[PDB]
């Protein structure tokens, strides 16, 4: 209700510890915090965890109270609830591991509960399909923000980080800061009143871009006929994947990629160009990486080594090794039956469709999802401008045996950040699938070098 006044008080902090690496690691925590004034959902509470040092005026890894990066992790994966993470949470989903780490590296920790397409209220209703995951988000981060002099740590280095949808989630935070669109959502569940552009994202395998993600699959995966996640494509299956490959190219096309010599990154008629090149050097990088550490990249077919170099690949021989794992379409289904289409229902309609395509060719009766807010949620239309309400630093993701979107849609994202002259730190993990936070070492390194 309007009573909760929103003011976070450090004295709510209890003290607490949990082992990290043979050491205990000193933290104190404030849970089940309702962040806005009128939720509709038991899932909208966040949790706080404070390295200790910063209640006893003391620093860690060259951070002090005022001044700590502020972590927001979230739990949503296929688009479903993510509850408020905690570094004692042992239930999925949870990167209970990685808040127990961002501790001991001195980060505040702001882990929200955020509804999903499977979330209803105390009527039965449907309260979590989209924008709900990205105004809770938001309505977390203006939390924050709105405490900045009573929290610890530093809410102008907000950081967020997600897997999957969550890392679409974090992605879009940083990409939408401040945007008006969501301010008659926020304002209904009365947020707090203050900004939710961030400072930086952490993405693992974003599944974003979700209306043009079928014809990327499809580019990637056409000519591949069995798919296993088992189930073998129909005669209209193959029709949809061959057309959905050809439109890959226009809508690629359009984009004005360009690469760092100036030149368009283009795809021809046949899905051939420029721009698969640069898929193709990435997936390369990611391998001698991988040999250069001893490891066996021929585990995948393919990759030409020419001594002690990966040379080139045979990409559709890596592709057809790595297997397709979704049918088609992978996103929109015709059926209405993917995470994605439930995302786009709301309280009336289970599920909707948000491309031409598939509500085309739909074999179920349905409605397509409302454009605007199709757009709302993808990142990338943020991005076609340098924005100062867009994070400035990114780091992004995306396993080379990560089959859950294809390859194009993390590279995209990576592609016009850089042309846009955002800070991008962006690569294809040798053999990771989909995944995330398993490379704690180097996304730390990563926050110092921005934050310290």
């Given at each position: 209700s309007m009573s909760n006044r929103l003011?976070?008080?450090?004295?709510?902090?209890?003290?607490?510890?949990?082992?990290?690496?043979?050491?205990?690691?000193?933290?104190?925590?404030?849970?089940?915090?309702?962040?806005?004034?009128?939720?509709?959902?038991?899932?909208q509470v966040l949790n706080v965890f404070v390295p200790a040092a910063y209640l006893h005026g003391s620093s860690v890894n060259g951070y002090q109270r005022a001044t700590a990066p502020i972590l927001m992790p979230n739990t949503?994966?296929?688009?479903?609830?993510?509850?408020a993470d905690d570094?004692?949470?042992?239930?999925?989903?949870?990167?209970?591991?990685?808040?127990?780490?961002?501790?001991?590296?001195?980060?505040?920790?702001?882990?929200?509960?955020?509804?999903?397409?499977?979330?209803?209220?105390?009527?039965?209703?449907?309260?979590?399909?989209?924008?709900?995951?990205?105004?809770?988000?938001?309505?977390?981060?203006?939390?924050?923000?709105?405490?900045?002099?009573?929290?610890?740590?530093?809410?102008?280095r907000i950081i967020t980080n997600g897997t999957s949808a969550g890392g679409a989630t974090s992605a879009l935070a940083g990409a939408s800061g401040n945007s008006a669109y969501f301010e008659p959502a926020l304002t209904a569940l009365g947020a707090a009143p203050a900004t939710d552009d961030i400072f930086a994202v952490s993405a693992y395998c974003p599944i974003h871009n979700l209306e043009h993600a079928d014809m990327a699959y499809e580019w990637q995966f056409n000519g591949i006929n069995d798919w296993?996640?088992?189930?073998?494509?129909?005669?209209?299956?193959?029709?949809?994947?061959?057309?959905?490959?050809?439109?890959?190219?226009?809508?690629?096309?359009?984009?004005?990629?360009?690469?760092?010599?100036?030149?368009?990154?283009?795809?021809?008629?046949?899905?051939?160009?420029?721009?698969?090149?640069?898929?193709?050097?990435?997936?390369?990088?990611?391998?001698?990486?991988?040999?250069?550490?001893?490891?066996?990249?021929?585990?995948?077919?393919?990759?030409?080594?020419?001594?002690?170099?990966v040379t080139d690949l045979d990409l559709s021989a890596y592709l057809k090794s790595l297997t397709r794992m979704k049918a088609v379409p992978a996103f929109d289904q015709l059926d209405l039956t993917s995470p994605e289409n439930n995302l786009f229902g709301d309280a009336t309609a289970k599920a909707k469709h948000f491309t031409a395509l598939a509500q085309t060719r739909s074999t179920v009766t349905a409605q397509l999802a409302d454009a605007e807010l199709i757009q709302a949620i993808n990142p990338l239309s943020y991005l076609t401008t340098t924005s100062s309400q867009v994070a400035k630093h990114?780091?992004?993701?995306?396993?080379?045996?990560?089959?859950?979107?294809?390859?194009?849609?993390?590279?995209?994202?990576?592609?016009?950040?850089?042309?846009?002259?955002?800070?991008?730190?962006?690569?294809?993990?040798?053999?990771?699938?989909?995944?995330?936070d398993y490379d704690l070492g180097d996304l730390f390194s990563w926050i110092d070098g921005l934050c310290q």
């Open positions: 003011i976070f008080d450090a004295d709510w902090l209890v003290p607490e510890q949990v082992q990290v690496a043979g050491q205990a690691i000193q933290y104190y925590a404030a849970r089940n915090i309702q962040y806005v004034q009128h939720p509709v959902a038991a899932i949503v994966g296929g688009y479903l609830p993510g509850p570094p004692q949470r042992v239930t999925w989903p949870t990167n209970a591991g990685t808040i127990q780490q961002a501790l001991k590296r001195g980060y505040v920790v702001v882990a929200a509960g955020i509804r999903g397409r499977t979330t209803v209220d105390k009527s039965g209703q449907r309260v979590g399909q989209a924008p709900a995951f990205i105004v809770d988000m938001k309505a977390a981060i203006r939390y924050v923000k709105y405490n900045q002099g009573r929290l610890p740590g530093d809410a102008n296993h996640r088992s189930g073998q494509l129909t005669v209209e299956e193959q029709a949809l994947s061959l057309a959905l490959k050809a439109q890959f190219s226009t809508y690629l096309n359009q984009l004005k990629l360009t690469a760092s010599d100036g030149t368009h990154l283009t795809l021809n008629e046949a899905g051939m160009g420029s721009f698969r090149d640069v898929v193709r050097q990435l997936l390369i990088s990611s391998a001698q990486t991988a040999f250069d550490q001893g490891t066996d990249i021929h585990k995948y077919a393919g990759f030409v080594v020419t001594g002690n170099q990114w780091r992004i993701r995306h396993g080379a045996a990560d089959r859950d979107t294809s390859f194009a849609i993390p590279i995209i994202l990576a592609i016009m950040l850089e042309n846009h002259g955002y800070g991008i730190d962006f690569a294809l993990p040798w053999d990771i699938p989909h995944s995330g």
